[PDB]
Amino acid sequence: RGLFDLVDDWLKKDRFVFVGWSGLLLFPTAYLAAGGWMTGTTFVTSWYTHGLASSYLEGCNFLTAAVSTPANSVGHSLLLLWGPEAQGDFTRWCQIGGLWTFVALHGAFGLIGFCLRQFEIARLVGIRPYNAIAFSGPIAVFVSVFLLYPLGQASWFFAPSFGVAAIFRFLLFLQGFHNWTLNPFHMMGVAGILGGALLCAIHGATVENTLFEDGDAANTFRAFTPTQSEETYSMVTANRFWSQIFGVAFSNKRWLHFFMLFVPVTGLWTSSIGIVGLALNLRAYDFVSQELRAAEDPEFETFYTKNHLLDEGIRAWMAAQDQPHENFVFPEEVLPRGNAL
Amino acid sequence: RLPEAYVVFSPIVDVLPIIPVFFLLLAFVWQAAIGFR
Amino acid sequence: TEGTNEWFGVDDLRLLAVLFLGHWAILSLWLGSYGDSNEDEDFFGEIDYSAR
Amino acid sequence: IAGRDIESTGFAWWSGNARLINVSGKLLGAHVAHAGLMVFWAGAMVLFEVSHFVPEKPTYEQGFILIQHLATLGYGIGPGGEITSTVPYFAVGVIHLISSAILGFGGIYHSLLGPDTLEESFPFFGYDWRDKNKMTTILGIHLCLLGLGSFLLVIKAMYLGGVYDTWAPGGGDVRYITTPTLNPIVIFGYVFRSPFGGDGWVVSVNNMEDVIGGHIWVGILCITGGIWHIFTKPFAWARRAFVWSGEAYLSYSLAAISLMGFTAALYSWYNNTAYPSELYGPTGPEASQAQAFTFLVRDQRLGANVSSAQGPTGLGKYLMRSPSGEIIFGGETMRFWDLRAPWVEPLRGPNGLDINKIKNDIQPWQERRAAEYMTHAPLGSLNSVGGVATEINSVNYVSPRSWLCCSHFFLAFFFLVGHWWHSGRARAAAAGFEKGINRANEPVLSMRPID
Amino acid sequence: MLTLKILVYTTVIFFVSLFIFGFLSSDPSRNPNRK
Amino acid sequence: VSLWERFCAWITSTENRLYIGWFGCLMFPTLLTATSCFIIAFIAAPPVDIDGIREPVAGSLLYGNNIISGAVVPSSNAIGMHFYPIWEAASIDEWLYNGGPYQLIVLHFLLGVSAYMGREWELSYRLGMRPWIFVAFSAPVAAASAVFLVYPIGQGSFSDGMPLGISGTFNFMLVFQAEHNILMHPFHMAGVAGVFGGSLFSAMHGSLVTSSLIRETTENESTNYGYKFGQEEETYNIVAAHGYFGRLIFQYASFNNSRALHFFLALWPVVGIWITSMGISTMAFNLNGFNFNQSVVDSQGRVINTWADILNRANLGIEVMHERNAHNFPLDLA
Amino acid sequence: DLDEATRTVVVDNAGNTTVLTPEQVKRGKRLFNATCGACHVGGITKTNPNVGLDPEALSLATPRRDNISALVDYIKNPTTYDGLESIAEVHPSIKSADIYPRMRSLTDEDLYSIAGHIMLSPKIASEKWGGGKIYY
Ligand code: CLA
Ligand code: CLA
Ligand code: CLA
Ligand SMILES: CCCCCCCCCCCCCCCC(=O)OC[C@H](COP(=O)(O)OC[C@@H](O)CO)OC(=O)CCCCCCCCCCCCCCC
């Protein structure tokens, strides 16, 4: 009837890719985060920001290419193309590291626009919105690492660059400087990721091994029409199996599939709380009862004090080349070496 | 390298160990042309 | 003496009488049912359901 | 088309060679075609390994794996691991290449024109999987060949040329095995050792007299057991324990071939007798001892008493004492104190490294050997740059031991998975429930209350 | 220490022999299909 | 009638509370001895010379530790790969000093887990199930045998084996990074994709079932009580969740087949952990990951740094500091 | 950016400087990594770390070894660091090239380019050459 109704009926039309209202936020912003990454890893260097090479023009393969974080002198500037740093020039915008905030900002509005996509399709199909709530897990890892972690730090420079090996140094930068593995929020996150991979490997292998005979063929994939009301695997058998192997087992398909939602997602929320606590440098660095004892008793050694000496090697050896803006000129005689290494 | 009566065929020999991989791909090409039936 | 090249780790002679009386004490249990059966009765199955 | 779609058989295209279980001509043509590929690779790889051979670099720096098996047989090898000729390596790679064109033609004949079942026309070759007299005959015929193939090593090491002994007195050279060891307390001494450190179950054969004397007993067993399974029939206990079907025999092999898969992958890491360090490069244990021996020579020239040289931990910096009492090298190399190598065994005694022989008799070929085996340690990378994991990109070396111990070991786990898949199906195909649970008769419902 | 050692080889080849003579005890026939 | 047949009937009975089976004949004695020694060695066990340099590393709770730092320490560098049982130790005090209980726990663990795996087969045979849950459990058995068995073999000592603890795990992972460069190795890459993908398809499948549940309850009681146990009606509209994901990405990327869907949940992690556990195995024999250090040069020939060179300087920090007293010679061959 | 001023290296004990043609610097790298680089990788010596390929360490040898003519002198006749006795029996050389199979096929221009690589590499990388793992 009205003008709003014609636009509402056009976006929600059955077509190849469902656009909806949320596609106006997703499809422009996701296309430019992805294309900003493919351009930045192919053409744009890191020679002026980090003093590296992170492009395909500079000989890096898929692994050692990245879209890199800007300089520490930029601080937390948004680095707009028209801004006071770039001033409209495209070429000087790329050399400062403007594509990285271009990827991260238009990417953050892609994950907004993709989670709104999951509320919109669920309302048209008419289902409960648990996909949009389980996808809030990965939103809490993007925001609290690519956005909330460099905000608490000195600049955008201490953020993960969007490249394969550039994530890998961020894994190593976070052990030596922060002791991230000791943090109980990672420990509750590893329990959800390795726990979530566990549940789909079991529920994959128990459904597929309690199937009913619905055909004479040896292939069991053929014997399932999608609109049938009979269940395709014996729940009573699978309960009787695991009650004797493992001792305790699900007797509820509604509780089972909810539990496959809770375990992976909670590991992304609990691990997201800790990385917000490392923006503020509130790290779980030391057990002081272990540290006061190892200072007074020069014979008491645990595995825990062995990890601190591994972190002095990370804090001293890479920090010269890690942070060229700070100009660490270490002598050879201050770098902690071991015996004969 | 190869003996002097065989130095001519030094490019062809370099391809030869790859050829057993090409039999693995020959099965799928044959399954595509048969229509996977 | 760890890195000696001795059979099944049998260092002393006394450990043999442990091994022989372990396999045989259950072998004799096993022969109480599956022993003393007909060793000449066949089948054209994949699997035999003969007796206890 | 009948027999070659899912409507006739019940197997999809991806599990398509499972249609060959209950046809015998198509199955025979498949096993002789894959045998045509095993041959064809080995002929074509050696020709590839000959055309890239350079006499300047050593045999292991050039990254070959197949022309070093023939040098252990003794073709074209000189004294000290120096490959001389490389005309006989050309000859072997052609016989294993021409012959695959014949085995290739059997795979294309027997599987495209041969009868589907041999049991109709050819009653000698035709069979059934459920038959137990025929299957032990097929096992028996193909065991007497593995007996005869073991004597070809023994004939070649005693009569036809000899084999390469790296322990040969005067240097490693092609040596006729005159007097092999035929003692079953010694030969089966290996088979019943511990697999752990120091004993090292079957890897630790340390001279060619036990190797060639051992392959005699293999030929004795595989012929008597070949004749045993031709004449006889499986006993009462053997008929009750197995599943006599087609896939069950395949999952019996896949368990045993994984045993051979791990063991050949552990020969290549530790053994320096069947795999000479002159050919395959130094072992993992050997390059750890060659470092400590090199700096032993280095600081002995500075007038330092190396026996009384107190280490930084309080142990021996150079010479310390093993937990069994022997004089060994010190460092992280104290774990590899069982390293028995032809360039360090001149310095042994009853006690271990003789201190009098270290102070006086170090020969410069041992210094040229320990410096060669330090710089070519088996530590590499997948892009084939050597050194430690933090080495810069200048050298191009990964040891051929690290390719064999990481690829046959790689396969030997997946063939253990093949024992798990193919025997889970074959035990359940014998029982009837491999297609799923019957809806009319579920076995769990006719049981006790659950508790 | 050679008295403990005797006790272990009893316990190992007790249970190993229950394993070996378990599957020799007509073990494929113990299925819910028949017998 | 016989005593053995009345014992085989009990040990293979599915009417027991826990199925014992013939693998339980060597699962239960193995894992109860790995357990009962672990609880004692974690709580009350004296310090252990791990580096072989007679510097004993404390690992138990009574010697001033906690849950995080306490760990069953691996055996000595002095022993190395040698089999070290109690009777080959001349006292228990000499056994506990040199890293005794690490070999007693690990060897009774790997036998009991490889028997727990075969026990999952056996009950599937006696219940009429298709058999292959135990093939999915091969993937953590591959990974447990990689860090406790295969990596001490190729490195030649149980002292390089993984410490049974929590802080000992991260001593294991970091030292494995400096010496082998696991992150650049494509098999750790193929299993990070296995568990990120595994936790994706877990929470993606578990949401689309819970989204499309059928009304069987009221708003006061729980959602889960609309499933009665052992019912034969399907508890969710699978056509509904297919039409949702058929619009969320596109139409042809959606499994309408629930059997092929529930197979892909078992494929992706298990293949990802088979491949990963053969990354530790091929890096046990010093076939390390990629090494792109000093790979990008200018025309003058000066080394231009990359991200791998920054990653290298993190590896050089751990390499020069791990086992800071055990080394005497310039190259960590072990 | 391989300028001829950067390719110009010192050639004799007096101090004359000649330039290296661009095939000398290319064969000089391939031959050095194939022959010498097993132990002398990046200027350090694996089997004797005191005696490196540093331009400081080559200069302090009792015959001065910085020159191209002095390095090819060392290859055909390797004395020690103090130059009193010969270690041709243990270092690979031309004089003792029956034991080392790696040096049976080397011409004069091939050693001229290998010694060119040892001399021109501290001019490219000032501190990485023979600086150990600190300067990787
Ligand atoms: C080791 C590799 C190998 C081998 C030897 C075989 C062999 C066979 N497969 Mg097979 N297969 C394989 C891998 C292999 N497969 C793989 C990896 C897959 C998964 C994609 C399949 C899937 C598959 C299916 C789905 C089916 C088979 C079938 C067959 C059999 C008959 C084929 C036939 O009659 O069709 C005719 C074949 C052709 C027309 C192919 C022509 C290609 C020619 C032979 C190539 C020759 C090239 C060579 C260089 C020439 C040398 C000549 C010589 C003179 C030098 C045959 C025994 C069929 C079967 O079960 O039979 C009952 C069947 O249904 N296969
Ligand atoms: C293990 C492999 C194997 C097996 C079991 C068979 C089995 C069979 N083939 Mg076949 N074949 C094979 C390989 C094999 N073939 C190969 C490799 C080729 C290519 C050359 C052929 C080519 C071929 C043709 C062209 C024909 C057969 C035929 C037959 C059938 C009758 C053969 C006959 O008359 O027996 C009696 C035959 C003999 C006694 C002659 C034996 C002579 C050989 C050279 C002795 C072998 C020497 C030695 C054992 C091998 C050592 C090498 C080894 C280490 C690899 C029979 C089922 C025929 C058939 O089915 O009829 C339609 C037929 O026409 N085959
Ligand atoms: C490729 C190798 C191969 C394969 C697959 C087979 C396959 C088979 N053999 Mg065979 N065999 C082979 C080589 C092979 N054989 C060789 C080379 C020999 C000569 C030594 C034998 C000697 C042989 C005999 C004597 C018997 C078999 C039997 C069997 C059947 C399975 C039994 C089994 O595996 O128990 C595995 C069992 C063990 C590894 C341990 C068994 C321990 C025995 C039973 C203790 C009793 C002492 C006994 C007299 C042997 C003394 C040695 C020592 C243990 C004291 C099966 C058909 C049995 C059969 O049914 O005969 C037809 C049988 O009785 N085989
Ligand atoms: C030798 C081998 C013998 C088997 C060994 C036995 C060990 C089994 C462990 C028991 C799990 C008990 C947890 C109760 C849990 C409980 O009772 O749940 C009971 C629940 C049954 O749910 P139903 O379907 O009955 O629920 C329907 C509705 O009523 C939902 O409320 O079963 C499961 O969902 C458990 C599956 C995950 C199992 C979680 C196990 C996590 C591992 C344990 C983590 C703790 C280890 C800490 C050590 C420091």
Ligand SMILES: CC1=C(/C=C/C(C)=C/C=C/C(C)=C/C=C/C=C(C)/C=C/C=C(C)/C=C/C2=C(C)CCCC2(C)C)C(C)(C)CCC1
């Ligand atoms: C930045 C920027 C921009 C732009 C944007 C865009 C427009 C972009 C796009 C772009 C794009 C969008 C890109 C793409 C790329 C792609 C690529 C380059 C791909 C590649 C691929 C590959 C290489 C792969 C491979 C493979 C294959 C082929 C098959 C098999 C498998 C594999 C995976 C291996 C603008 C203007 C706004 C401005 C601002 C800034």
Ligand SMILES: CC1=C(/C=C/C(C)=C/C=C/C(C)=C/C=C/C=C(C)/C=C/C=C(C)/C=C/C2=C(C)CCCC2(C)C)C(C)(C)CCC1
């Ligand atoms: C050449 C040589 C040699 C020799 C060799 C020998 C002489 C060998 C032997 C071998 C042998 C002598 C082996 C054995 C093996 C055995 C086995 C491995 C067994 C197995 C078994 C089984 C598998 C069983 C199973 C079962 C059970 C347990 C229960 C029931 C069921 C059944 C029956 C299935 C030497 C050392 C001098 C050195 C080097 C060279």
Ligand code: OEX
């Ligand atoms: O023990 Mn445990 O960590 Ca395998 O690397 Mn060599 O050893 Mn000792 O150092 Mn580094």
Ligand SMILES: [Fe+2]
């Ligand atoms: Fe499900």
